[PDB]
């Protein structure tokens, strides 16, 4: 009964959340190599900054 009530209540607000999460996740998901290269170079530069 609790699962039925939760799905009944949260259904009308689910499609917009799915669409927004899909769009924002695909913003980064189609740039995986660029993001990882950015993280590596940022690791190098930030390590240089933090050590000094």
């Amino acid at each position: 009964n609790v699962l039925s009530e939760t799905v009944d209540q949260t259904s009308p607000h689910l499609s917009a959340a799915l669409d927004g999460v899909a769009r924002f996740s695909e913003t980064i998901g189609k740039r995986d190599e660029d993001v990882k290269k950015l993280l590596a170079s940022a690791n190098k530069v930030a390590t240089v900054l933090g050590d000094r």
Binding site: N1, L3, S4, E5, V7, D8, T10, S11, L14, S15, L18, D19, V21, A22, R23, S25, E26, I28, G29, K30, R31, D32, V35, K36, L39, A40, A42, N43, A46, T47, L49, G50, D51
Partner: protein
């Protein structure tokens, strides 16, 4: 060994089976006693009837809930996810891709976090010093640009 009573079929002669076959080691000696902990009994038919009736009454339809808990959950999940299969698939694929990309660079990201932590922990106290430095730099450069040449 465990002595379990077995009912082989619908109408049969019940037997006692010593469940673990012998593969070596110490053996069951003559005059041994097996207590209730190491014995088993068949399920019986009245127990089956009682449990079937109990589950069909507890988890079945009622006047307040005409469809039953399972009917209600099936109806709610069918109505609440109708047309959202493709949207959910796309959202899950995007989330998996993005989080996998973040997880592959997770070590680099948290090294960045620890380094920026050291940076801010060393530079945060002298903020008025930085404002004064900017103003003094502006004034010092103004000291040499009062005219064009």
């Amino acid at each position: 060994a465990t002595a379990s009573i077995l009912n082989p079929s619908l109408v049969a002669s019940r037997v006692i089976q010593l469940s673990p076959p012998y593969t070596g080691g110490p053996t069951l000696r003559d005059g041994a006693v097996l207590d209730v902990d190491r014995t088993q009994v068949p399920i019986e038919y009245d127990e089956v009837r009682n449990q079937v009736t109990r589950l069909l009454a507890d988890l079945g339809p009622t006047p307040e809930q005409p469809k039953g808990p399972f009917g209600d959950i099936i109806e709610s999940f069918a109505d609440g996810f109708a047309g959202k299969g493709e949207q959910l698939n796309r959202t899950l694929r995007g989330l998996s891709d993005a989080l996998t990309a973040l997880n592959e660079g997770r070590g680099d990201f948290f090294a960045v976090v620890k380094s920026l932590a050291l940076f801010v922990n060393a530079l945060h106290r002298s903020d008025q010093q930085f404002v004064a430095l900017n103003n003094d730099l502006a004034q010092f450069t103004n000291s040499f640009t009062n005219t064009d040449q």
